[PDB]
Amino acid sequence: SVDQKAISTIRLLAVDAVAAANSGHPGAPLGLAPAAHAVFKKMRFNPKDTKWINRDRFVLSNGHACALLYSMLVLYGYDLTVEDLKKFRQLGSKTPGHPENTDVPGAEVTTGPLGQGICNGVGIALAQAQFAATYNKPDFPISDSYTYVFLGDGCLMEGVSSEASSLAGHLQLGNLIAFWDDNKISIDGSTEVAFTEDVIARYKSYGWHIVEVSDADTDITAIAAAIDEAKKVTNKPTLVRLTTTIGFGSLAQGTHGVHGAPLKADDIKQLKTKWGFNPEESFAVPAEVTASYNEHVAENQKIQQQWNELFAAYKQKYPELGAELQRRLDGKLPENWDKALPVYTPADAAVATRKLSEIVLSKIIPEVPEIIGGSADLTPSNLTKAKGTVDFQPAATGLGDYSGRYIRYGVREHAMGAIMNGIAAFGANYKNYGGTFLNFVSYAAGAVRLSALSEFPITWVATHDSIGLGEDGPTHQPIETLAHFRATPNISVWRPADGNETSAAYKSAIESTHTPHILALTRQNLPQLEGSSIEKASKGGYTLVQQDKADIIIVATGSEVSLAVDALKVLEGQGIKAGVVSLPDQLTFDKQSEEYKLSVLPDGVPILSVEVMSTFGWSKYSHQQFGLNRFGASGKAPEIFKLFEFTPEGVAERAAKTVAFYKGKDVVSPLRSAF
Amino acid sequence: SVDQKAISTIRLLAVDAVAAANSGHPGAPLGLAPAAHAVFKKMRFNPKDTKWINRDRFVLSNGHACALLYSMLVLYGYDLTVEDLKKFRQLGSKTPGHPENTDVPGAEVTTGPLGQGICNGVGIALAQAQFAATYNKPDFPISDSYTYVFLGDGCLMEGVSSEASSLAGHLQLGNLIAFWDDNKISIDGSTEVAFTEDVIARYKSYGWHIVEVSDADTDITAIAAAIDEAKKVTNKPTLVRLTTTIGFGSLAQGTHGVHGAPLKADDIKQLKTKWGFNPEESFAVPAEVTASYNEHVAENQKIQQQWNELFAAYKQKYPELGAELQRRLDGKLPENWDKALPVYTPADAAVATRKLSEIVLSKIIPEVPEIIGGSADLTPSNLTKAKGTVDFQPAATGLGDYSGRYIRYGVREHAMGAIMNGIAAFGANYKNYGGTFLNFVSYAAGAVRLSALSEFPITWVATHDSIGLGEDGPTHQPIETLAHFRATPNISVWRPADGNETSAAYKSAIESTHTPHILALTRQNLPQLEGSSIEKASKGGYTLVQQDKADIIIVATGSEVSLAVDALKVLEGQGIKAGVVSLPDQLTFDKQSEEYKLSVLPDGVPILSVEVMSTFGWSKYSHQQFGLNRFGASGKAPEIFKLFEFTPEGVAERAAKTVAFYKGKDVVSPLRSAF
Ligand SMILES: CC1=C(CCOP(=O)(O)OP(=O)(O)O)SCN1Cc1cnc(C)nc1N
Ligand SMILES: CC1=C(CCOP(=O)(O)OP(=O)(O)O)SCN1Cc1cnc(C)nc1N
Ligand SMILES: O=C(CO)[C@@H](O)[C@H](O)[C@H](O)COP(=O)(O)O
Ligand SMILES: O=C(CO)[C@@H](O)[C@H](O)[C@H](O)COP(=O)(O)O
Ligand SMILES: [Ca+2]
Ligand SMILES: [Ca+2]
């Protein structure tokens, strides 16, 4: 049949791509081709408009199987061709060894690190539910799309997928349909060696619906029926168990050897001849397959055309909601939204930056509907919920509604991070955030790095940033954390010192379109600084206190800026004149002009950094570094600062030693380099 | 009764400790005191010998509840007193806000970061099973101890505990008995808001046995009976559901407000009077409670005395095993074990450091019985299993035996990391390791940081260290990872360049008693270096190529040392004389004498670092840094190196620019500082 021919075409494109690269993973593509064919035939999508907001989304969570995804995209006429398949895994190609949303048309997210994609799918589905609750009206199903996810055994072993699956079941996300490639083979061999749990029983315990397809190597009728069944269960996410043979058709089918290496050439020949293809030919695309797939594309394009007319009619019937929706689909924030950001003066009271963050959120959430977010069971500590908002919950619970804006993630940092990526991936200008303690952002490093690589504008509201948290002690006090994330490409790491800087940090985080943000916020109160403003802090680094005859400049962040200002006064009594630079975001600063940066960190003056955590990275901006390169302590925070000499006198002593160390030396800016 | 009085004493000590600190968590201690009393009465332990190898172990995974643990330790006469309880959460005390194994007698592990302790308990139980299988003989139950773990709802939400619980069920760890504090309250309020899964059904799906105690606020008879029942089920770990009221007895019992803040003074008064205590008194310890607890201690000490005689008789009956066991309990490796480490010369073939690591393990595992380890489903890629070893599995599976040495962790990096901590915590000189790709060590950051804080000598075998892995692409290629872990206190991060350096890295990792190791290893082949040795590499950094008239020194690690040596030859043709330093472990280097370090990185010469990942940290050792501060690419590895100019010519160009940049300048060692 043409369907059988399509499945063979998919299988053979994937195997031929792996063969051409002499690298990659043929097994899961061979096993999952029937399911991929069946699912894409049920999906609504436009290969010529990858951003249609009412498309069904597909996520390949088992990203190593990407030769399968690329084959589907090529067959359906996305902006990806057989010539791109021939360049699978080759430097600079559009067919990298794991899918990248920035590079691959039709890749919704970046997968490859196991466990992530299913969580991303939870986030896409969460966003779709929130979006539909916000915009749909009687006779106006603006959003009614599904989220389809393929996943393997490795994904099911990773704890992040358990977190997201527990939460998705709690949230009754009925438009999520996941498919488990139940092939009983991982890299170490049989799943009997390490993975003998009853997966189906576990998913039932989370509140998922289950459909089992016992012969998923061939039974596309049953796979299609499973999708229909899943669509009838509107209050549970569904897991479809696809019992497959890894490498189906290969001489080496059902073995670990077909997971992750190219097939032998003789194996590929017998595959082709068993399926009616020419064993002398590679990258074959039968025209009948193209015709069949084109018919589905044409039907989908008519569906999108009708959706566009529905949207036009919606804008007439619901003028304000329609304009809001249009603005969001154009990727634009509300005009002058930032006028809602709070502004402070030096006469205002001292406030913890966690509380300043609460106040910002309270002002901007009512003004910017595309902001949603939550906390990982730290709502009353992170201060992440605006008063007067309702939680995102299924209405059946009585605890919220899908129109809600605040997500109770539970104690699930890693899944929160990956769900945030999925919410961003949904689109519609979502600007979403997640709160935890800064030290526990590290639990989510797998997802955070993918936010950076995927260029998603997500925001971590990361409170309790340092030893300033006090009594909870060294298991809670960050040391390495900002160095880790600052060393990751494309992460804005804001550590605001005061009210104006906190508003600048949020301005950056909400305006972002391609850069994730981490906001490192304090438990303890900090004073409003003389010299701070949103304008200056928006440059990432700025001169807080200018001293034309400076003997030293102190560069600091966060809670240490006020410390530096106090040290300047001690130094004045020692006959040393200091300037102060505040560096609330190193990435934003780095992006400023060379001349701007040199105006902040000039030649001809020693520069000392002060920040109560690792000194890594700080030599970019300073000659000497005063930091904390050991673990913390359990005690009242001011006593810990005193112990480690993060006091005005301790900073002054080190500043004076710095001045003395550079006596008789020629000093150039830390910004200078040889290459 | 005296048991009732003991429970009240525990509750009130915990509440009074929180009150004195005006900080901490009274709720779970109040709810769990009956269970703590019952479990400690069943446990075998010696407060005067915390390291007795056949003790039962207790782990408080819900570490915020540590006022409960400290109260138990004080009542049982560990080296912790009521005066220490009065200093709960105070700077420098023995009663920090979360338990620390380095600081607190009777704290087996460091908990506080949720999810970790249950995984640590899995590791303690895994080690006990392996240890018993290795040493027990007929009439010689050298090891027969249990592992008791308390955990809360937050622990059950964290994905790491799902990973470890799936694995523990697979491994049939019948001496693990965990207790869930089923109080339905977390920080964000009711568990109905985010945690509605059927926990018991999930644990059954993992192959755990379940006991439910419906009235755990009072029914210590049922808690004791649950332990007896769990001990009869020898092939399944057991979860005991303790249905409790958070803050039991408080006016605010059953509310989130009692989770994490001190009780009101009037509340504490009514607690005391309801339980027969003096509301005017704090830190009361009724002598009858002390007497009761002392009787159990005395009985346990007689049990240990008998164990010591059993051990003496074992050494007579089994002389070789007995001497091995004695050596391990003394914390000593086999005499001259390191003579098994492979040694290479520059005439030997190029080898990937992953393969060199395989070869080391193959030589040392047969010589050092206390080495065990595994991989997170990457055994044939990490090369972590010695040929001729058997896997650690329950014999009932037919797939291994508990005497086995190789653990199939599955795709569970985070739990692997926390299980490794538990294996180390067991003691008996275990030197245990875990393999994954370096980029996915990041999935386990929560546990890795705790290895460092807890001072456990665990080892990560972290292969595929860079863009040198090639085609899998940027989702797999580390950039930030070594900076992250190097910035963490107390982590040795070895990046060996060749065979001799790889042997030095293992010498360090296996000899370690207080410092975790990460071994960053290559996919690709590297040459054996002229000038390397175990002796020199054991210093962490050393002069590989000495040049007395150097214009520049190039400092490098791993795969970039050979690159630096090739660049030296290009530079010679440009009239520039270079030296080369190899820096296989920055931590070990830092610990050398000032004079040694200055012999490697002298004054008076520019120093350029070369390492194909983040430049963070490198200014400690260099004036200029050539690194990779962007994400990688999917392609053949040599083409990626060429793209980023990590070539002999690219390094030489930057070296020449460095020499030119310092012309006419006075240069001092990067090791110098102002303070
Ligand atoms: C173990 C591992 C894989 C086995 C999958 O086994 P699986 O899901 O059962 O896939 P299969 O049916 O055999 O093709 S892929 C690559 N990876 C290394 C790998 C490890 N950890 C993380 C976080 N991401 C990864 N990418
Ligand atoms: C959420 C959070 C807690 C709630 C526990 O809730 P729970 O287990 O149900 O405890 P309970 O019965 O209410 O006392 S503690 C502190 N913590 C912050 C916290 C967050 N993430 C990590 C990894 N470790 C933590 N320590
Ligand atoms: O991490 C934990 C305990 O392991 C939480 O219970 C925190 O102790 C608490 O949220 C801190 O509260 P505040 O810092 O907001 O007072
Ligand atoms: O991470 C994955 C895929 O996401 C594994 O399948 C690796 O691709 C494989 O283990 C690399 O193998 P070698 O580098 O040992 O050839
Ligand atoms: Ca599989
Ligand atoms: Ca609880």
CSV table of C-alpha atoms in Angstrom, one decimal, chain B residues 379-545:
chain,number,residue,atom,x,y,z
B,379,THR,CA,29.1,1.1,29.7
B,380,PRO,CA,30.4,0.6,26.1
B,381,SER,CA,31.0,4.3,25.6
B,382,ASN,CA,32.6,5.2,28.9
B,383,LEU,CA,34.5,1.9,29.0
B,384,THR,CA,34.0,1.5,32.7
B,385,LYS,CA,33.6,-2.3,33.1
B,386,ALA,CA,36.6,-4.6,33.5
B,387,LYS,CA,36.4,-7.7,31.5
B,388,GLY,CA,35.9,-10.8,33.7
B,389,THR,CA,33.9,-9.0,36.4
B,390,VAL,CA,30.3,-9.7,37.2
B,391,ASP,CA,27.6,-7.2,37.7
B,392,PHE,CA,26.1,-6.3,41.0
B,393,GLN,CA,22.6,-7.7,40.7
B,394,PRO,CA,20.4,-9.9,42.9
B,395,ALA,CA,21.2,-13.5,42.1
B,396,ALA,CA,17.5,-14.2,41.6
B,397,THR,CA,17.7,-12.3,38.3
B,398,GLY,CA,20.5,-14.5,36.9
B,399,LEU,CA,22.2,-11.3,35.7
B,400,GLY,CA,24.8,-10.9,38.4
B,401,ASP,CA,25.2,-11.4,42.1
B,402,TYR,CA,25.6,-9.1,45.1
B,403,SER,CA,29.3,-10.0,45.2
B,404,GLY,CA,29.5,-8.3,41.8
B,405,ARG,CA,31.6,-5.2,41.2
B,406,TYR,CA,29.9,-3.4,38.4
B,407,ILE,CA,26.6,-1.5,38.7
B,408,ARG,CA,24.2,-0.9,35.9
B,409,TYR,CA,22.7,2.4,37.0
B,410,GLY,CA,20.6,2.9,33.9
B,411,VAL,CA,19.9,6.5,32.6
B,412,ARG,CA,20.0,7.9,36.1
B,413,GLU,CA,23.0,10.3,36.5
B,414,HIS,CA,21.7,12.2,39.5
B,415,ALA,CA,20.8,9.2,41.5
B,416,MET,CA,24.1,7.6,40.5
B,417,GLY,CA,25.8,10.6,42.0
B,418,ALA,CA,23.8,10.4,45.3
B,419,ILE,CA,24.1,6.6,45.5
B,420,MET,CA,27.9,6.9,45.1
B,421,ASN,CA,27.8,9.2,48.1
B,422,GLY,CA,25.9,6.6,50.1
B,423,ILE,CA,28.4,3.8,49.1
B,424,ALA,CA,31.2,6.1,50.3
B,425,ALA,CA,29.3,6.8,53.5
B,426,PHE,CA,29.0,3.1,54.2
B,427,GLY,CA,32.7,3.1,54.8
B,428,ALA,CA,35.0,0.1,54.7
B,429,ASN,CA,37.3,2.0,52.4
B,430,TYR,CA,34.9,1.8,49.4
B,431,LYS,CA,36.4,3.7,46.5
B,432,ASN,CA,33.5,3.9,44.1
B,433,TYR,CA,33.0,5.4,40.6
B,434,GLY,CA,30.3,6.3,38.1
B,435,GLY,CA,30.6,6.8,34.4
B,436,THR,CA,28.7,9.1,32.1
B,437,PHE,CA,29.5,11.8,29.5
B,438,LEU,CA,31.0,14.8,31.1
B,439,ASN,CA,28.2,17.1,29.8
B,440,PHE,CA,25.7,14.9,31.7
B,441,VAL,CA,27.5,15.0,35.0
B,442,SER,CA,25.6,18.3,35.2
B,443,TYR,CA,22.4,16.4,35.6
B,444,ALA,CA,23.8,15.3,38.9
B,445,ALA,CA,25.1,18.7,40.2
B,446,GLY,CA,22.9,18.5,43.3
B,447,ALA,CA,24.7,15.3,44.4
B,448,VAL,CA,28.2,16.3,43.1
B,449,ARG,CA,28.1,19.4,45.3
B,450,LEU,CA,27.2,17.3,48.3
B,451,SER,CA,30.2,14.9,47.5
B,452,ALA,CA,32.4,18.0,47.9
B,453,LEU,CA,30.7,19.3,51.1
B,454,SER,CA,30.5,15.8,52.6
B,455,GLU,CA,34.2,15.1,51.8
B,456,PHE,CA,33.5,11.8,50.1
B,457,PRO,CA,36.1,10.2,47.9
B,458,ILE,CA,33.8,9.3,45.0
B,459,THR,CA,34.9,9.4,41.3
B,460,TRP,CA,33.1,10.4,38.1
B,461,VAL,CA,34.5,8.7,35.0
B,462,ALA,CA,33.4,11.5,32.7
B,463,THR,CA,34.1,10.7,29.1
B,464,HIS,CA,33.5,12.6,25.9
B,465,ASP,CA,34.9,15.7,27.4
B,466,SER,CA,34.7,18.3,24.6
B,467,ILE,CA,34.0,19.1,21.0
B,468,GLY,CA,36.5,16.2,20.4
B,469,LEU,CA,33.4,14.0,20.7
B,470,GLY,CA,32.3,15.3,17.2
B,471,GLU,CA,29.0,14.4,15.6
B,472,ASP,CA,26.7,14.2,18.6
B,473,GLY,CA,27.0,18.0,18.6
B,474,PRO,CA,26.4,20.9,21.0
B,475,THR,CA,23.8,19.3,23.2
B,476,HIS,CA,26.6,16.8,24.2
B,477,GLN,CA,29.7,19.0,24.2
B,478,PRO,CA,30.8,20.5,27.5
B,479,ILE,CA,31.7,24.2,27.6
B,480,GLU,CA,30.9,25.4,31.2
B,481,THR,CA,31.2,22.1,32.9
B,482,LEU,CA,34.8,22.1,34.2
B,483,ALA,CA,34.5,25.7,35.3
B,484,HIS,CA,31.4,24.8,37.3
B,485,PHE,CA,33.1,22.0,39.2
B,486,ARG,CA,36.5,23.7,39.5
B,487,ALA,CA,34.6,26.7,41.1
B,488,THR,CA,33.0,24.3,43.6
B,489,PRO,CA,35.2,23.9,46.8
B,490,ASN,CA,36.9,20.5,47.2
B,491,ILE,CA,36.5,18.9,43.8
B,492,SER,CA,39.6,17.5,42.1
B,493,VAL,CA,38.9,17.9,38.3
B,494,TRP,CA,41.5,15.8,36.4
B,495,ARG,CA,41.8,16.3,32.7
B,496,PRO,CA,44.7,13.9,31.8
B,497,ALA,CA,46.6,14.4,28.6
B,498,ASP,CA,48.0,10.9,28.1
B,499,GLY,CA,48.6,7.5,29.6
B,500,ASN,CA,50.9,8.6,32.5
B,501,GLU,CA,48.6,11.4,33.4
B,502,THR,CA,45.6,9.1,33.4
B,503,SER,CA,47.4,6.8,35.9
B,504,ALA,CA,48.2,9.8,38.1
B,505,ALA,CA,44.5,10.8,38.0
B,506,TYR,CA,43.5,7.4,39.2
B,507,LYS,CA,46.2,7.3,41.8
B,508,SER,CA,44.7,10.5,43.2
B,509,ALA,CA,41.1,9.4,42.9
B,510,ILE,CA,41.7,6.0,44.7
B,511,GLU,CA,44.0,7.4,47.4
B,512,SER,CA,41.5,10.1,48.2
B,513,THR,CA,39.8,10.1,51.6
B,514,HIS,CA,38.1,13.5,51.6
B,515,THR,CA,37.9,14.9,48.1
B,516,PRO,CA,35.6,13.8,45.2
B,517,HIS,CA,37.2,13.4,41.8
B,518,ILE,CA,35.9,14.1,38.3
B,519,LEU,CA,38.1,12.5,35.5
B,520,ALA,CA,37.4,14.4,32.2
B,521,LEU,CA,38.3,11.9,29.5
B,522,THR,CA,38.4,11.9,25.7
B,523,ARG,CA,36.6,10.1,23.0
B,524,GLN,CA,39.5,10.8,20.6
B,525,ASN,CA,43.0,9.5,20.6
B,526,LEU,CA,45.9,11.5,22.1
B,527,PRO,CA,49.7,10.9,21.8
B,528,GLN,CA,51.9,9.8,24.6
B,529,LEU,CA,53.8,12.9,25.7
B,530,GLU,CA,57.6,13.4,25.9
B,531,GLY,CA,58.1,14.5,29.5
B,532,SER,CA,55.1,13.0,31.3
B,533,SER,CA,55.2,10.7,34.2
B,534,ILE,CA,53.0,9.6,37.1
B,535,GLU,CA,55.4,11.3,39.5
B,536,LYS,CA,55.2,14.7,37.8
B,537,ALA,CA,51.5,14.5,37.0
B,538,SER,CA,50.8,13.7,40.6
B,539,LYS,CA,51.7,17.3,41.4
B,540,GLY,CA,48.6,18.4,39.5
B,541,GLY,CA,50.6,20.8,37.4
B,542,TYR,CA,54.2,20.4,36.1
B,543,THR,CA,56.6,21.7,33.6
B,544,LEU,CA,56.4,19.4,30.5
B,545,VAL,CA,58.8,21.3,28.3
